[PDB]
Amino acid sequence: SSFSRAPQQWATFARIWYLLDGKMQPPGKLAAMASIRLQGLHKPVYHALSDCGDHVVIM
Amino acid sequence: TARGTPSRFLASVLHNGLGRYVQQLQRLSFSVSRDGASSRGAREFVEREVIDFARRNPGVVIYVNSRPCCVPRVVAEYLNGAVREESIHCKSVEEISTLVQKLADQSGLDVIRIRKPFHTDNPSIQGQWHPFTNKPTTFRGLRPREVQDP
Amino acid sequence: TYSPLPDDYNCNVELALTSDGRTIVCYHPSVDIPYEHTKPIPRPDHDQVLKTRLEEKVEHLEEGPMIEQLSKMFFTTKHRWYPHGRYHRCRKNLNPPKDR
Amino acid sequence: VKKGFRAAFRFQKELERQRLLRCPPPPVRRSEKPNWDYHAEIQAFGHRLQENFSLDLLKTAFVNSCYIKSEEAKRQQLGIVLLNLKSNQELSEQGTSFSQTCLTQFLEDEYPDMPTEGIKNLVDFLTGEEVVCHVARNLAVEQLTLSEEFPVPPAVLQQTFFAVIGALLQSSGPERTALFIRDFLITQMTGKELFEMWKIINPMGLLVEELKKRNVSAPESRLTRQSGGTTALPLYFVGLYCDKKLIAEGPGETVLVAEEEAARVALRKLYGFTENRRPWNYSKPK
Amino acid sequence: ISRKWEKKNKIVYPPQLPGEPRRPAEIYHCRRQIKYSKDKMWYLAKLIRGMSIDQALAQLEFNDKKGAKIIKEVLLEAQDMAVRDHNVEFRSNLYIAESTSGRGQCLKRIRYHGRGRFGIMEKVYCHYFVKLVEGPPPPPEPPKTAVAHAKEYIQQLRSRTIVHTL
Amino acid sequence: QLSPTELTEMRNDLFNKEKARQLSLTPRTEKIEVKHVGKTDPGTVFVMNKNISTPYSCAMHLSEWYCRKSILALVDGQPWDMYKPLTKSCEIKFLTFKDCDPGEVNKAYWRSCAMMMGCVIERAFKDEYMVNLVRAPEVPVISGAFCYDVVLDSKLDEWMPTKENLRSFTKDAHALIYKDLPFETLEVEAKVALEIFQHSKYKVDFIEEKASQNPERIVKLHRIGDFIDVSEGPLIPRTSICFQYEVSAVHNLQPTQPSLIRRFQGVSLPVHLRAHFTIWDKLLERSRKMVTED
To answer: How close E28 comes to chain F (CA, Å)?
Structure first.
C-alpha cells in the first residue's frame, strides 16, 4: 500500500470500536459476538500473544 | 533448546544471488602433521584432493601449514568476518572432502535456530490487511448512531 | 446481475474460466473511497499585558493514582504498569532479531 | 593431586577462553594475523567477484595516501630504495565519477517520473558512506586495504571501494563495471521505502509543487476512516482528492500525521516508486 | 583467601590528553576480619551506598550498631588516603560508589546444648569493602513518570509484528 | 536598535570578556595562605590559588556542612561572596543565617532576593512594552519586604498588577529558584561597567554614583544566568537558597509627574529559616504594605 512502516503497523493493529444493540436479543448470542471481537478473533492478523482485541459497546 | 539458545531470521550476505552469486568462503587454513596418526587423512587429502579443490574454488585462498600437531584442524573464514574452526582429527579423506565442500557452500552466518524458513522484504503486493480493508464506507462518513446536520 | 460477494468494499471481483477450462482468472481492481463518503478534515481550535507563561503541566501523582490513570487511558488492567524485579529485567534481550 | 595430563590441559584451554572474554584483545588487521599472503588474497578478490581485474591496477586501488605518509615516517625514524608507490586517489576519482553517472542512468531509466532531486538523493544514499562501507566490508575490501589506522576509517574505506571500481573500469570497460554497480550497489535499495533513502520535510509542500507542474488541482484532505478519535490510541485515514478523485490515502495516529503520510503515499505513486512496483530486473541482458 | 581489593589502588592510568575530560579519582579500601556478621554488616554497608562522604559519616556516627563505628573508621581512613596518596583535592568531594560486606574466615568452637548434645558454634568474622569516587553524589534516578509509562506502552504496541506468518 | 534578546547577548559577551581579562592578569598559579579564624576548626590554613579559588573552595576543604550553611564569608573582616575569588592571603570566616549576629548575612539575602525580582519582572512583560530597572532600594529586613524600583512603559501607566499577575511573577521567581543558578560576581572599573549598561540611563546614573564613592572607581557587578545587574554589596551563593518567595505587591511612588516609578515588593525566607504556613501568611500581609526607604 506504499505506507510508511510505522503508519502501516499502526493501522494493522489499530483498535476498532464496535456498537451492539441488545434490545430483545439473547445474552449468549450477544456474548458470543462480543467474545470474538474482544479477543481479535475476527482479524486475519490474530495471535494470542498479540494484544489485538477490539472495543465492544453494548447498549 | 530453542529457549536456551539464540536465534535469527533467514538472511543472506549482501543480498547474495540477487545480482550475482558470490562464494562467501574466502579462506581455508589447514594444520597438518608430517608425523602423526591423527593427521593421516589430512596428509592424504593434501596429496590428492587439495589441489583439485583449489582449482575449483579460485575465490578461496588455501593455506596448508605442515607442523607438529596432535589435532589437525581446518579454519574457514568468510566474507562477513565469520570464523569457523573444524577438526579433521583421524578423519578419512572422504570425510575431510565432505567437510571442506560443506564449508565452501555455507554462507558464514551463525548456525543457530532460524525462526522462519522464509524471508521477504515485500510480503504484500496488494496492501497489508488493516481493520478497514473489508469494511464498506458510508455516506458522509457518519458513525453508528450519529446524526447529520447536528 | 449476480455477484458471489458484494462489490462495495475492498475490490470488485470478476471470475472467469479460460476457454480450455484449466485456468481461473480473477480481475480485482481496487475500490476507491467515494468523495461523498468522506468527512472534512477537522479544523484545529483582553488585558494580557504580561507575557504568556509556559506553565509546566507536569503534576506529581502517587503510584496508585498514576497507574489508575494509565490503566483507564489505555483500557488495561493495573498489573502491567507495575515494575518487575532485576531478574526479569536483565533476562530481556535488548538486541532482539529483526526481520525486515 | 590426581595423576593425568589431558584434563589439566583441557582446563587450561578453558581458562584461556575466559581470559580472552574477560579482556577481549584489541582488534588487529587480518594482514597481521597468520595465514596471510597479500598477492594470493588480491588474486582471489577478483576471481571471487568473477572479474578480470588488472593486478597492477587493483593493487594500486588499495594504496591510500595516508598509508604512504605513515610508511615514510616509519622508514625515516628507523633509518635504513626510493619508494614510487602510487596512491588510489586517481583511481577513486574515476570510480566515484563513473558510479555517480552510472547509478544516475540506472535510476533515471527505471524511474523516469522521479525528479532530479529524488534521483540525486538516491545516488547519494547508494554511494553514501553507510551503504558503501557496509558493502566494502562484506567483500573483503577492508582486509586488502592499506591504511595507517585499523579499523579503516569510513572515509578511507569508501575511497578504496570506489578506487576498486576505478580499477575495474580501466580493466574491463564501462559495460562490465555497470553490472558490478548493479549487483552490489543497486541491490542495496532492496526492501527500502523511497523516503527512507531520500529524506524530505513537508511532503505536502512538495506534492503541491509536483501537481502544479502536472496542471492537476491542489489536493484536498478528507477523513476517509476514523476510529477511537477520543482515545489515547486513535486511528485516522486521510485521503487526498483532486477534483473529488482520490489520489492517495494514508493512516496516522493523528489527523496531521495521517495527512502527512497521505502526502508521502501520493508522492510515491507520482514518482513511480510504490511498494508494489515492478521489481528491478537483474536478468542478464538479452 | 583473596585480597584483590587491596591491589585495585595500584592501577596506574596513562596520562590523559588535554581533550579528555578529567577522570574522577577512585579509592579502594577495606578492613579484613572484622568481628561481626556480614549479614548485620550488610545493612550498614547498604545504608551509605551513594551517599557523600560527609553524609555517610554523619549517619554512621549516630547509628547504634557496632558495625557503624567500624565502617566510620574505614571511611575516615579512606578519606585521608584519597587526599594524601591519590591526589584528591577536596576531602569532602567524595561519595560512596561501592559499599559491601563479605564473609571472613570464621572460627568453629565446641558449644553445648541443654540436653548434653555436642555442638559447633562458629565465631563469625566479616570484611567491609568501600570504593570512594571523587565528585558529588550522583543524583538518584527520579521516579518513573506517567508520561514515561505512556511512551513505553505505546512503543510496545508499535513494535508488534504479525506473528507466525509470511 | 538592539532588541531585548540582543541586548542581553551584548551584556553577557562584555561580561564574559572582562571576566577572562581579569584571569589573564595572573598567568601562573600563585598560592595565597588563607587562615581560618572561625570558632570551629581553629588554626586551619588554606593554601589556595590566587584569583581562582573562592571561599566556597575553602569550605569544600573542610566539610560539606560548611558548603551547605556558609551563606557569606568574612575575608579580613569584610563581607565576601562565597564564589568571589580570593585576591590575596588573608583571614577567612564563614557566616550562616543562624549566627548570633547575622546582620551582614541578612543584607546579602535581601539584596540577592531583590535582584532575583528584577530578572523576573524584566522578562515578564510583553515585548511591546519597555521595562526599565531604576535600582534596588536598600531596605532594612525589619521593614517586612524587599523592593525594586521599576519605571514601566508609559502605555501601562493606568495598568495595575492584579492578584493573578502577582502570582505569575512568583511562578517565574520560583522557576529561577528551581534552576539553582550561582550568583556570579565581577568587580570591574566604572568604565567597563558603563559600557554594559549604556542603554539604560538609570543604571548609568547608579554606576557613576557608586563609582564615585570608591576611590578606585570599581563597581560590583552580579549575574544570575543571563541577567546582569549592579549591586551594592555581596550576594548569596545560589538562588536555590530561597524556599519561600513571593512578590507581595506593586506600589506607585509619588511624584508620578516626572516619571512613574513603581515599587515592586516581595518577601522571602531561606531553606534554613523556613516558616510555618500560618506564620508565612502573616509575613505575607505586611509585605504587601508599601515600604518607605529611610
So the answer is: 21
Question: Is the distance from CB of F243 to CB of F133 less than 8 angstroms?
Answer: no
Any F CB within 8 A of E79 CB: no
| Partner residue facing C55 (CB), from F125, F159, F171 | F171
Q: How far is E4 from chain D (nearest CA, A)?
A: 16
- Candidates E88, E66, E70; CA nearest to E132 is E88
Q: Are residues D140 and D189 in the same domain?
A: yes
Per the CB < 8 Å rule, is E157 touching D232?
Answer: no
Residue D233 lies in domain: 202-276
Beta pairing partners, B87 = B73
The residue of chain D with its CA nearest to that of B25 is D48
Measured in angstroms, the CA of F235 and the nearest CA of chain C are apart by 28
d(CA A54, CA A38): 5
Residue located via cell numbers 520560583: F174
Domains parsed from chain E with CATH numbers: 1-166 (3.90.470.10)
Asked if A17's CB is within 8 angstroms of D268's CB, the reply is: no
**Cell numbers 604512504 label which residue?**
D68
Under a CB-based contact definition with an 8 Å cutoff, are residues E99 and E127 in contact?
Answer: no
D38 and D107 part of one domain: yes
Q: Which residues of E fall below an 8 Å CB-CB distance to A? A: 157-158, 160-165
Contacts of F287 (CB under 8 A, 6+ apart): F144, F145, F246, F248, F249, F265, F266, F267
Experimental method: cryo-EM
Task: Verify that D44 and D132 share a domain, yes or no.
Answer: yes
Same domain, D50 and D179: yes
Give yes or no for a contact between B42 and B32, defined as CB atoms under 8 angstroms apart.
yes
Q: Check if the beta carbon of residue B143 is closer than 8 Å to that of residue D230.
A: no
What CA–CA distance (Å, rounded) separates D268 from D262? 10
The resolution of the experimental structure, rounded to one decimal in Å, is: 2.6
Same domain? For D208 and D260 the reply is yes
C-alpha cell recorded at residue C64: 496508585
SS3 D106: helix
Q: Report the C-alpha gap between F46 and F31 in whole angstroms.
A: 9
Chain C to chain E Cβ contacts (< 8 Å): 18
> What are the chain B neighbours of D190 within 8 Å (beta carbons)?
15, 18, 121
- 3-state secondary structure string across E22-71: CCCCEEEEEEEEECCCHHHHHHHHHHCCCCEHHHHHHHHHCCCCHHHHHH
